[PDB]
Design a protein around this nucleic acid. Sequence first.
RNA 1: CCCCACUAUGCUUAGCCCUAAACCUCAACAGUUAAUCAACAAAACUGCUCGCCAGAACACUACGAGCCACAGCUUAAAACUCAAAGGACCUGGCGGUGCUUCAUAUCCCUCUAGAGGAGCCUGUUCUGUAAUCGAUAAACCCCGAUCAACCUCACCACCUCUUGCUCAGCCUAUAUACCGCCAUCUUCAGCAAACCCUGAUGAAGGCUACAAAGUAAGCGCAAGUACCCACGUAAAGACGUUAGGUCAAGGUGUAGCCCAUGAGGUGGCAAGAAAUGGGCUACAUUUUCUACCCCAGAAAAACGAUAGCCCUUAUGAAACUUAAGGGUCGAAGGUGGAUUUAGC
Lengths: 132, 128, 76, 199, 295, 23
Amino acid sequence: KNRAARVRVSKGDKPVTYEEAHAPHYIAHRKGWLSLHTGNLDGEDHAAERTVEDVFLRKFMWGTFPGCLADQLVLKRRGNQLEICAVVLRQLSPHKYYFLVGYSETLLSYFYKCPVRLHLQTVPSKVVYKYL
Amino acid sequence: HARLRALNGLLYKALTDLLCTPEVSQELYDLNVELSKVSLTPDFSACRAYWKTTLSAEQNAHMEAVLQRSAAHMRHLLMSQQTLRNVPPIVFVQDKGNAALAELDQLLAVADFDHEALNKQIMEYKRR
Amino acid sequence: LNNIFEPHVAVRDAAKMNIPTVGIVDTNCNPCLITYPVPGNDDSPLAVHLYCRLFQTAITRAKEKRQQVEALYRLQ
Amino acid sequence: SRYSPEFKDPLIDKEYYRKPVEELTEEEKYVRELKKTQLIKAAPAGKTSSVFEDPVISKFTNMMMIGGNKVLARSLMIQTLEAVKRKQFEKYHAASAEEQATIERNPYTIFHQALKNCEPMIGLVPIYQVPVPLPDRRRRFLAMKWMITECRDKKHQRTLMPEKLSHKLLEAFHNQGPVIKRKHDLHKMAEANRALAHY
Amino acid sequence: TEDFIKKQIEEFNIGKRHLANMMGEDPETFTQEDIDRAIAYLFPSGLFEKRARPVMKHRAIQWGEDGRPFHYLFYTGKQSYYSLMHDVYGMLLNLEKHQIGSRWLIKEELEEMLVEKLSDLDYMQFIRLLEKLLTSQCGAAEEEFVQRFRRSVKQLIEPVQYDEQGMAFSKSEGKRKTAKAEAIVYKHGSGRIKVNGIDYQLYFPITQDREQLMFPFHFVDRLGKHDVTCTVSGGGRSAQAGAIRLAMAKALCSFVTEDEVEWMRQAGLLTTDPRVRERKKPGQEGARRKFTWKK
Amino acid sequence: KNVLKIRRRKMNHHKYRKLVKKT
RNA sequence: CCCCACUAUGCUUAGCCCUAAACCUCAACAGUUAAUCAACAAAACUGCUCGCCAGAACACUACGAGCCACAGCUUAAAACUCAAAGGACCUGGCGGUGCUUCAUAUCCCUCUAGAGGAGCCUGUUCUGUAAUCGAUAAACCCCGAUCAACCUCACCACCUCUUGCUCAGCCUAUAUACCGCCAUCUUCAGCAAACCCUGAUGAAGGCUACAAAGUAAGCGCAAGUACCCACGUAAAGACGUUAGGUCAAGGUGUAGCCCAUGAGGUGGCAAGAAAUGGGCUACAUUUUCUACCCCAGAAAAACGAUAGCCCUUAUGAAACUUAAGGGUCGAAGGUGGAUUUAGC
Ligand SMILES: [Mg+2]
Ligand SMILES: [Mg+2]
Ligand SMILES: [Mg+2]
Ligand SMILES: [Mg+2]
Ligand SMILES: [Mg+2]
Ligand SMILES: [Mg+2]
Ligand SMILES: [Mg+2]
């Protein structure tokens, strides 16, 4: 059986978002890519660099916002601009959210030498697409 | 096995005697069914009587249906006559073998013209 | 009675759910669990038509009397 | 198959569409009307409306084909037909008028007659090798396969396929040759196993 | 409830007005097609499953606030199906007292029509009742009822054109495997066929390809009655021959009678052969050839 | 019902008869 | 057991013997059908009386007694031992056990091309080496590897280092601790929570379409989507099955090494007695060589090595071990057994 990036139904109680509820063979069909850059296009270079940067950004935003990210990040690259769009819970205080936004933006901009921006969309709770 | 062969012969004779009479039913006697052979299952679970089938398909189906209907009654009759103390269920199987021979006759009228095995291991062990 | 001459399961279900049941019971019926059994023929077309007409008239009369009473109270 | 089951095989026959309406029966008229509402498969590259199109020769060419080399198989078949016709013409011109009347010169007729003569009426199948009747399709396939296998035998050295096939076809046209002998041996074996045929 | 639906309707109207403002369109004539085009432009999603793309658009409850159901057959649990059966039975009673390219809709279509879920046996019962209605010499009032449940089950021909030289001609195209051909057939000619500017007997040394080219004209008995110019690209000799054959037949349809067009369609001269090379799959030698199964 | 009690009775009777025959 | 012959015996007379699943397994008599009844059996009881029973086994026994009985019958114990014995049901299955239908590249035959014969290539096993590991019937065997001359490398030999590139490290043990990613039936359509009803509310059961207690969210199939259609191929393919594979992708539980089971350098294997799997090239004339890319001319005992030897070139620091080319050699082989693979 295929065990890759799938959520197995056990009791119809586990809540899953839209991303988790869809198997990989649905990426081109029901859930667009979580990252958008030109590196993987035809004739374009630096695909590996973009992949490594995306992995580091995901692992860094996951730990910088512990228990706050509702779903996986969305990374967009436009020229040298990098935009991280994150769905976040409303558990933490807004002061801490703004502190983390400023800190993460400045640190990522200085680390990757690109004008990083971070857009947070707040939700009361993790949106449940279905139960498994 | 000898006992199976003897029982097969006895059951074939008994069934042939049964079907030569209106005893089972008038319709079955009117059908004039014939048998080629009778074979018992190795575990004595069933008794297959191979009855010859005529060329007519509808008549063959009618005869097979009547035989299937009367198989249980014939089994009871055999147990009543004490030809066998325990008679397994009787299954009437169509026999089309003679049809192939008949068609071959029709077409041919127009056709134109132990110790040694282990001795190897023993030899190898002796040499080794 | 159902089509196999057993009592309709709806009778037992309504008794379970405490729903009163009016019922036309023939000689072979079981009026034990029916709240308001009416012993009568249930096979003749005339009898069934009479029952349908009677219940229709009763319900229509009740509804129109309810409308009349409500209107009269409003006009009070 | 890329064709849905709704599709129907094409009917490449000009005479069918040239038949007058009056001669059509009620069932034939209904069939023609129904065909107007049915999807039709594309005409296969093998068969056309050509008056010289012989389905038997086309099937024989397909059987002779090795590794999809249809051009080579067609060339071998036409060379065989030409060789048969040339040998028949030589025999005709070298024979007297009385023999000339009997001598046949149509290669297609000779090919069909040889295949018919090589058709085995009855064959054998395990059930014991019980002799059993053969459907006409199986008969034609067995005749063609026997002819092709006999021509492909290594017993012939350095001789081209068209010459060997023409020689075997001419032999079979006169009810002689290895293929007719094979058919007679099969029939003899069926006669011998007549006893076991009751299985 | 209906309150939620009405709130959604008001929200959709307000959002439609905002969308019309954003696109600069007239808020009055801003129809559903305009809404869909605006949404597709503003939120371009290339997800293949069209149901997953963004969409801005406009089941119900069968009882009111007092708890009384609206339909008298509600407690059956299949009120739509049984109401339909009741109406059909009433029509059959009325008919009894007073005295092709269409098929019955499939169970899925019936369920969509009745917004309910029905078993196979229920569908068969309804279909048998409808057939009895049809066979009962039903009038137009019931024939329209039947046609509510009825579902319907010819080749277009290119027109004749004229060239600079003054000849009358038609042009068509076809394809076979990986070969594409475009053919031009003149109304009057002498049987000359030129492929890519080369005479056909020189461009097609194989006799089978020439027979394939002959097949369309020979079928309608028009050998030597036309002149053909074909441009074919891709594929092999046989694929090119088949593509040219299909294109020539399609173009010649413009000059033969409709009966001959139907005859050619029945002969397969007009159907495009969908048989194309099947892709090789991983874990097997070819399209279908598996690897040697070891033991 | 199972005849295990009857089987035990039969076995005991057979053994008793054998013992009586022996001695 | 079967066949034949034959005896006690079955029969009569006159006595004995007194045993049976001697069973309607339901004691005799009287009465009732009123609110049923553990189960099964033959619907449930009441009144009354007689006989009998008090765990199983010892035990249709021993002893005593009686009897026409003498290997008998009736009556009938105890000691030792056991935690059960037993009655009726419920759910049960596996059985090289038949019959009738079937399988659609599928179980057999039939169709085509193969494998099993030869060389070579490649993997495995064995042999050997000082010199990895994992894979091991289907579901391993051109497998991890879309790849090993050094590196890769985890192996071996020798030498070197000790808070070590790392707030160390370990390719050290355990896939029978796991995540992760998968095989397999699956070329399957079932898995199912949550309710409802039946059996007196027992282990359980829930099927009737002219329908009689089932409904079912959800999962999967389906559908939808990709490719060229609506077809087809992909993709998908649940729950379960093999304590299935991988601790050597990586992570991690447990346990172990810490002057070494860690780290580094130099050098080195990898062969053939042999068997086996798979692949390539062929054994030719439907062929070989050449032109051409399909109207030809030659060859035809030659056909046939990508093998062996030599040389050159490419890559590289390094070619003996890689690849390409050339020269030379022209061998085995002559369509291959049982068996077996794949294709609609
Ligand atoms: Mg009644
Ligand atoms: Mg008795
Ligand atoms: Mg008594
Ligand atoms: Mg006794
Ligand atoms: Mg005693
Ligand atoms: Mg005594
Ligand atoms: Mg070694």
